[PDB]
Design an enzyme around this catalytic site. Structure first.
Site, PDB file in Angstrom:
ATOM      1  N   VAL A   1       0.258   2.107   3.559  1.00  0.00           N
ATOM      2  CA  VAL A   1      -0.437   1.037   4.266  1.00  0.00           C
ATOM      3  C   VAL A   1       0.368  -0.257   4.376  1.00  0.00           C
ATOM      4  O   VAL A   1       0.957  -0.722   3.400  1.00  0.00           O
ATOM      5  CB  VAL A   1      -1.791   0.726   3.594  1.00  0.00           C
ATOM      6  CG1 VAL A   1      -2.531  -0.379   4.355  1.00  0.00           C
ATOM      7  CG2 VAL A   1      -2.643   1.985   3.531  1.00  0.00           C
TER       8      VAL A   1
ATOM      9  N   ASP B   1     -12.205   3.195   2.220  1.00  0.00           N
ATOM     10  CA  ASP B   1     -11.886   4.573   1.850  1.00  0.00           C
ATOM     11  C   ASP B   1     -13.001   5.455   1.273  1.00  0.00           C
ATOM     12  O   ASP B   1     -12.811   6.143   0.265  1.00  0.00           O
ATOM     13  CB  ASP B   1     -10.660   4.593   0.929  1.00  0.00           C
ATOM     14  CG  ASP B   1      -9.398   4.112   1.630  1.00  0.00           C
ATOM     15  OD1 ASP B   1      -9.407   4.039   2.875  1.00  0.00           O
ATOM     16  OD2 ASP B   1      -8.405   3.803   0.941  1.00  0.00           O
TER      17      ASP B   1
ATOM     18  N   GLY C   1       0.808  -1.203   0.000  1.00  0.00           N
ATOM     19  CA  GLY C   1       0.000   0.000   0.000  1.00  0.00           C
ATOM     20  C   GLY C   1       0.844   1.257   0.000  1.00  0.00           C
ATOM     21  O   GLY C   1       1.700   1.439   0.866  1.00  0.00           O
ATOM     22  N   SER C   2       0.610   2.123  -0.981  1.00  0.00           N
ATOM     23  CA  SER C   2       1.349   3.375  -1.094  1.00  0.00           C
ATOM     24  C   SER C   2       0.628   4.327  -2.041  1.00  0.00           C
ATOM     25  O   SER C   2       0.127   3.909  -3.086  1.00  0.00           O
ATOM     26  CB  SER C   2       2.770   3.108  -1.602  1.00  0.00           C
ATOM     27  OG  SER C   2       3.556   4.286  -1.560  1.00  0.00           O
ATOM     28  N   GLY C   3       0.565   5.601  -1.662  1.00  0.00           N
ATOM     29  CA  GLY C   3      -0.091   6.592  -2.498  1.00  0.00           C
ATOM     30  C   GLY C   3      -0.250   7.951  -1.837  1.00  0.00           C
ATOM     31  O   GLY C   3       0.352   8.219  -0.797  1.00  0.00           O
TER      32      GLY C   3
ATOM     33  N   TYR D   1      -2.850   8.999  -0.453  1.00  0.00           N
ATOM     34  CA  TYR D   1      -3.704   8.822   0.714  1.00  0.00           C
ATOM     35  C   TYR D   1      -2.892   8.440   1.954  1.00  0.00           C
ATOM     36  O   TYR D   1      -3.410   8.451   3.069  1.00  0.00           O
ATOM     37  CB  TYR D   1      -4.770   7.758   0.432  1.00  0.00           C
ATOM     38  CG  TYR D   1      -4.208   6.440  -0.052  1.00  0.00           C
ATOM     39  CD1 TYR D   1      -3.819   5.450   0.847  1.00  0.00           C
ATOM     40  CD2 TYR D   1      -4.045   6.185  -1.409  1.00  0.00           C
ATOM     41  CE1 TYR D   1      -2.986   4.412   0.440  1.00  0.00           C
ATOM     42  CE2 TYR D   1      -3.210   5.161  -1.840  1.00  0.00           C
ATOM     43  CZ  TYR D   1      -2.736   4.238  -0.916  1.00  0.00           C
ATOM     44  OH  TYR D   1      -2.029   3.141  -1.352  1.00  0.00           O
TER      45      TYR D   1
END
Ligand SMILES: O=S(=O)(Nc1cccc(Oc2ccc(F)cc2)c1)N1CCC(NCc2ccccc2O)CC1
Ligand SMILES: CCCCCCCCO[C@H]1O[C@@H](CO)C(O)C(O)C1O
Length: 337
Positions: free
Chosen positions: A34, A164, A27-29, A31
């Site tokens: 994660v 989300d 998870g990466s972005g 936002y």
């Protein structure tokens, strides 16, 4: 106060309570970042999200508070809720990082479809759960607005949780009124998304594969048809009305043709969701009573949410105010049963 431990994961620094072990990036972005983790307290794997730079700007600060408030309020089986929230900081002064914890289901809808060919019964169960969660969030006057398979967590029993929501390719599932930038929209933008997801599960292919928004808009209009006198009547901007008619010049497509071999009831429901006029789109609560979900529908087990105080949304505060409000919420957090 739990003892924390630092760890470097993919360039990002992670400081979490020793309670969470075996961190693994998923998870990466924009936002945030994660990681999957083993919550040794319960024995279950969880998802830990470290918010990017929570207090870098007013917009960041407000969205940090927003996500915290949202997650703290959601208590429903088909919607992600807050298992834990923490910060390595011991004071408001040192407060600069926010971590959120929730259930880790294991896979998303895209992954499920990748490995298994969905049966019509799978479709009713999956869409039923999405709609059930949607009835809940919508009742609290919250809209996902970016519903898509990657925002749908599914466990090995094909049970689902919406992820989300209330924060916001993405475009394939986006409602036309958003792509057209018509102002002030309603909760049914999420229903349009559900329609695009359901179609996909039935046909195995993207319903509106538009290279760009215009290409996609032409594909949408081609299927659900030119806007009738009734819809055009609610569009003030002359330029908006003319432009939309200009995009509906592709040869008309028949709805039944597109979904040939599917369950007749499925197609009927699809027709009620993929309605151009959002005022005429079936709502989540109404959808749950559709005959397509006969085997799963239960009016005594499809609750709405407690009143949700989001008056903060119409507030313009300074970074330090948003930061203090967030810190207070972190401190007052009481974990679920
Ligand atoms: O592949 S994931 O890293 N898996 C995942 C799985 C479970 C929870 C989670 O995020 C958390 C973790 C803990 C929380 F308390 C809340 C959310 C992420 N994740 C990445 C981000 C994606 N959503 C993007 C997104 C974010 C804000 C607005 C619209 C959006 O589409 C959804 C899937
Ligand atoms: C015109 C066809 C392409 C765009 C479809 C948009 C359909 C929107 O439909 C609806 O939108 C709501 C606002 O979001 C409203 O307030 C409406 O009055 C309405 O009709």
């Amino acid at each position: 106060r739990p003892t924390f431990y630092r760890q470097e994961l993919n360039k990002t620094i992670w400081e979490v309570p020793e309670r969470y072990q075996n961190l693994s990036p998923v998870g990466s972005g924009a936002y945030g970042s994660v990681c999957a983790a083993f919550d040794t307290k319960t024995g279950l794997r969880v998802a830990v999200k470290k918010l990017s730079r929570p207090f870098q700007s007013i917009i960041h600060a407000k969205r940090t508070y927003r996500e915290l408030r949202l997650l703290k309020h959601m208590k429903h089986e088909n919607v992600i809720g807050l298992l834990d929230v923490f910060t390595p900081a011991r004071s408001l002064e040192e407060f600069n990082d926010v971590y959120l914890v929730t259930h880790l289901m294991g896979a998303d809808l895209n992954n499920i479809v990748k490995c298994q060919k969905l049966t019509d019964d799978h479709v009713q169960f999956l869409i039923y759960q999405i709609l059930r969660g949607l009835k809940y969030i919508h009742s609290a006057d919250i809209i996902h607005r970016d519903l898509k398979p990657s925002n749908l967590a599914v466990n090995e029993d094909c049970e689902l949780k919406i992820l989300d929501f209330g924060l916001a390719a993405t475009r394939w599932y986006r409602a036309p009124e958003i792509m057209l930038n018509w102002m002030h929209y309603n909760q049914t933008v999420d229903i349009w998304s559900v329609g695009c997801i359901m179609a996909e599960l039935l046909t195995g292919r993207t319903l509106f594969p538009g290279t760009d928004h215009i290409d996609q808009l032409k594909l949408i209009l081609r299927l659900v048809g030119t806007p009738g006198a009734e819809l055009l009547k609610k569009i003030s901007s002359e330029s908006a009305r003319n432009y939309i008619q200009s995009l509906t010049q592709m040869p008309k497509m028949n709805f039944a043709n597109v979904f040939i071999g599917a369950n007749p009831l499925a197609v009927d429901l699809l027709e009620k969701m993929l309605v151009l006029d959002s005022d005429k789109r079936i709502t989540a609560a109404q959808a749950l009573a559709h005959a397509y979900f006969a085997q799963y529908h239960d009016p005594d087990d499809e609750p709405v949410a407690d009143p949700y105080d989001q008056s903060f949304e119409s507030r313009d505060l300074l970074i330090d105010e948003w930061k203090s409000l967030t810190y207070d919420e972190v401190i007052s957090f009481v974990p679920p049963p």
